[model samples]
Target: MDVLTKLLNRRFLPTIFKREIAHANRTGTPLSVLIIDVDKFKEINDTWGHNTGDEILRKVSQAFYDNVRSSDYVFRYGGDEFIIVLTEASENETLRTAERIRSRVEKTKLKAANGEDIALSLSIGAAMFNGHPDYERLIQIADEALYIAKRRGRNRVELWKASL
Candidate 1:
């Protein structure tokens, strides 16, 4: 468990991922994986102090956990990254969740350690998984999409295309 945050740590990711994939295979449903990163995190930390940056992460984490279905799992992937495992979700359904999270973070009010207002945003990347059970490969796909989102500009969600 990541005591720093509310969700399970990344170490549990692979086990849960394996089980989720097995469930998908049995139920013939699909999984949607979203990798979310805090946009301009370093800048925020540098300018506002780590406290302000940390505040954003806490609020963002709450928003993410609150937005997902109870059946799904959310994990703290790193200092400013999260991984969501959306079970039995379709493409459109997954996109809807992603947008909700992005919008929620964008609108949430925050304050700096020194009492300055802060605006925060997230860059999200989604990938579909119906076949592969290779944990590392799956994350790579979503991570690459996240890279694309950052490349195009942050604070958006990019879907990985077979062709994306």
Candidate 2:
């Protein structure tokens, strides 16, 4: 468990993902993933100190937990990165889920160290399971989409594609 957010740590991600993959293969259910990065996190930490950064992560974790379905699993992937495994979700469901998280983080009220509202940004990349060769490959796909989200600008959701 994470000390700050009380969410599961990254170590659990691989085990949970493997379990989900087995379930998906047996039931032929759709599984999706989202790689989320908190934007401008370094700035927040540098400006407000690590305590405020920790506060931001805790709040972000709350948004992620509240926004995703109960069946979904959220993991603190490290630093400002987080991973969400969504089971039995269609493409639309995956995209919409990412959008909801992004929007919720953006709109959620947060106070900085100075007791002022600060806009928080989230960049999410979504990828669906399609007999992915391996766990690392799946992460690569989602991370690729995440790169695009950051490239396109920041604080938005992007879906993985074969070529796009």
Candidate 3:
């Protein structure tokens, strides 16, 4: 099950994330959300098998939990997409966190069922909250960043420009 279903239920993480963004707005604390997707997951499944793909997901999720602070929350957004919430993080910190995850994922060498090692890539998107006009607006910005990250390449972190 994805973290969304496990922690907040399938229908709830989005709602909760939005609510938290609103709270951050009221408190004037820096808040950011990251969307990370494993690159070439489909290729892995195509070349290896479903079992190996599953292992990759589990291992990646575990790696994320191990690296992030307890104050941060991670969710299996859907498919190969994982969402991370960082409370009180500035744009720089958010990028650093994403980069850490990227480096860790790159170093991971997943063993296939047939005993071959494989590599995976990640795409991360982040949006900073700085007393935004509203929570909805903040999420919209974050979502735009996510789109940009995907567009730039498979493994990169993108931020929403104020003008965007």
Candidate 4:
């Protein structure tokens, strides 16, 4: 069964992350993590209404769910955040996937129940396995990169690098 919002719950995300890490370590495959945040989401909720906010969440959740492959995993990490696990995806592939999702979210327009058009944007941070295969580290790197993406400006995707 789905999480009702079309994404997995945060409680299950860490277990999947650990499992993917172990699988990547064993198979020497490239695994990627992406942390996504809806831009200015609090404003949408406060300005519009809870119904509008919920609608936006559903639309964005569906957008991300539709863009991934069958093997990929999507999780609702927080109130306005989501995470994606890309198994067997290279660093470049992860970046491209994150960019595509970012663009797709930006292009999608959510309409409130009042028929008011709402703007949608996403800030995504991506990280690839670095032979360490530590789920905590991977998430930390991706979350840090996501902060960078927000700093640079919302609606963009940033790949985690050593320098960052």
Candidate with top lDDT is: 2
Pairs that collide, model 4: none
Summarize candidate 4's per-residue lDDT along 129-148 as a digit string, tens digits: 78664578889999999999
Q: Give the TM-score (vs. native) of candidate 4.
A: 0.91
Put the candidates in lDDT order, highest first: 2, 1, 4, 3
Write one digit per residue (lDDT tens) for candidate 2, span 1-164. Answer: 55455667788877888888999999999999999999989998888888888888988898888888878888888789999999988999999889999998999887765788987898998999889747778889999999999999999899999887
Candidate 3, 1-164: lDDT as tens digits: 55323432335556666777777767877888777788878998898888888878877787788778887777766888877778878888888888888888888987766787887878777887656555556667777887787787767778888665
Segments in model 2 whose C-alpha atoms lie over 4 Å from true places: 1-5, 113-115
Assess each prediction's global lDDT (C-alpha) against the native: 0.86, 0.88, 0.76, 0.86
Clashes per candidate, residues 3 or more apart or on different chains: 1, 0, 0, 0
Question: Once superposed on the true structure, which residue ranges of model 4 sit more than 4 Å away at CA?
Answer: 1-4, 113-116
Candidate 1 positional error at 71, Å: 1.2
Error of 3 at 67 (Å): 2.1
Would you estimate the TM-scores of all the predictions?
A: 0.92, 0.92, 0.82, 0.91
Give one digit per residue, the lDDT tens place, for model 1 in 1-164.
33345687889988998998888889989798999999999998898888777767778888888899879988988889999999988989888899899999998877665776787899999988848769678789999999999999898999888776
Q: Write down the worst ten-residue block by lDDT for model 1.
A: 1-10
Quick one: ranking by TM-score, best first? Answer: 1, 2, 4, 3
Error of 2 at 21 (Å): 1.1
